[model samples]
Target chain A: CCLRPLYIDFRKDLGWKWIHEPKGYNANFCCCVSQDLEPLTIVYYVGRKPKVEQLSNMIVKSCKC
Target chain B: FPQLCKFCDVRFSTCDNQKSCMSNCSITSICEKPQEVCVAVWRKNNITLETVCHDPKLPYHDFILEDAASPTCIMKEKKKPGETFFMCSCSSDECNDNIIF
Candidate 1:
């Protein structure tokens, strides 16, 4: 399985910071996501090595969630 | 999914779609729900003090304030009250048998 973590930036009003999941859940997304602002390395996993088609689906589903 | 054509008259494959968009569009399949949880929250003006404890990778974090003279005391802790914390855990036997069809 492959795990992909994203860093979400929440403190948008304070300008952008290069820091990865810097402040922590500036807001909440889904149920496990801490930050929905910036792309933080939260974590994503595919049951297997998804092909392009399957991977795309996984991404779409994950994003929608 | 067919309704997509009504919104977007143009027909394009995933690869071609990315090419035409002129950006990194490497998506292949449709995505599932992204797991979300309220990990933490803060009320004080201090944004650095807010910490998400459930994150196994990044256990803690802080935003530090510095002065030219460097004569101020650095404040930090395991994060007590006045903060929020979210939790995340896994289930049993999530076997990924390399079946990403």
Candidate 2:
């Protein structure tokens, strides 16, 4: 797990091979050797313009989308 | 192949046609990916409201995949939603530690 490739931009930057370990499904992300990787967690992407008054009042929950 | 404008939580057109003309938004392009996450510690007892990014990993996956990173605060980040975030015990420090709130 320590030496696993976390992120890979296949279509844009480069290609990668999605390999499956006996344990589970995995993607063999290929990139620079010294990219100085860090813990990458999923985040919410805010686009151009948001038109909402009570955005916070909205229920903030997690999803896999 | 180009960036698109998503306003009011609605995704609009792309940048391919806006060339050789003036535009209202920015010239920069981006692949806007918005995923939902959970606001685990939003209780009535808490004072300030904080929206932290969670790691879309275990526990939540068995339930939902979006459980990892969420509460994007888009309405709060770019625009003013009158929402103030406060630091709490449930944070990425337990995972990523990106934002305090």
Candidate 3:
């Protein structure tokens, strides 16, 4: 098996209203993984912490055998 | 039966966050408590040291260790954002020798 991308709908994932956008999780195929990671900027529907910020290491950007 | 694992602690560090230097080294011993998994923890921030050890099997782990369930050790950055250390756990002899970091 190898690392495959599994799209995640943040809204449905944890019922987050602010994020309808999809994300990736290595929670998948298998194999090994390192830093194929990057970041994504997100805005919150509610004013909690930072109104908007970039979430780093969003996913195992990519993987291999 | 217990597992035969590569046991070492290289306190020295490396900047090559993507590469592990444990393979060339060989100091091994049998594990106790019928060790079921091999573990490795490495960190890099211009410095990376690794420790290899083994432990008894467990039915579950925190979400951080799902990667440990793989046949191969997949070192994952357990903490978020701030550049930090990583860890992986597997269940094969000397499996921690070559970490996939």
Candidate 4:
């Protein structure tokens, strides 16, 4: 299923950035991946477009390995 | 498999009190056992670190920290009162051992 891409503009820096995941994880939560704290980008599925604040909150509260 | 919570004996002074802080203080008797997550809590004057096992259904399972001048990806939160709290969470064996403020 192809869904339209929605662009979100943020006023404040969300600390972590978000990236698109072509093949997303099959979970209800957000996934965070960073290496040596280098340009970390959060991967999200190509599904429902969540609000920018909602997504940012999810990223901020995500579990890390 | 779980990781043991170190620094159970480490002491920190908050204001006028010096206290020993551990997330799961009485969860286990030996202090070294299976744990799911390690959390670090930071403040303006003091920094407290501890290891804890969190429930999988909790919101912390998806917590992320990307703020900090360092490469450790220490996440920071600033309050309106000018007080800030920096924290980071890692899932591994004793991964929270050497967290720097």
Name the candidate that leads on DockQ. 2
Clashing pairs in 4: A61-B62, A61-B63, A62-B62, A62-B63, A62-B64, A63-B62, A63-B63, B2-B34, B2-B35
Each prediction's Cα lDDT score? 0.22, 0.25, 0.54, 0.35
Per residue, candidate 2 scores C-alpha lDDT tens digits across B44-76 of: 222322233223453321332332333222111
Off by over 4 Å in 2: A1-65, B1-41, B59-101
On lDDT, the stronger of 2 and 4 is 4
User: Model 2 over residues A1-65: C-alpha lDDT tens digits?
Assistant: 13343334432343211111112222333222322323322222233322222222112222221
Best to worst by lDDT, what's the order? Answer: 3, 4, 2, 1
TM-score of candidate 4 against the unseen true structure: 0.32
- For model 1, the stretches where C-alpha displacement exceeds 4 angstroms are A1-65, B1-38, B46-54, B63-101
TM-score of chain B of each: 0.17, 0.20, 0.68, 0.45
Computed on C-alpha atoms, the DockQ of candidate 3 is 0.01
Winning candidate number (lDDT):
3
TM-score of each: 0.14, 0.16, 0.46, 0.32
Q: By TM-score, highest first, what's the ranking?
A: 3, 4, 2, 1
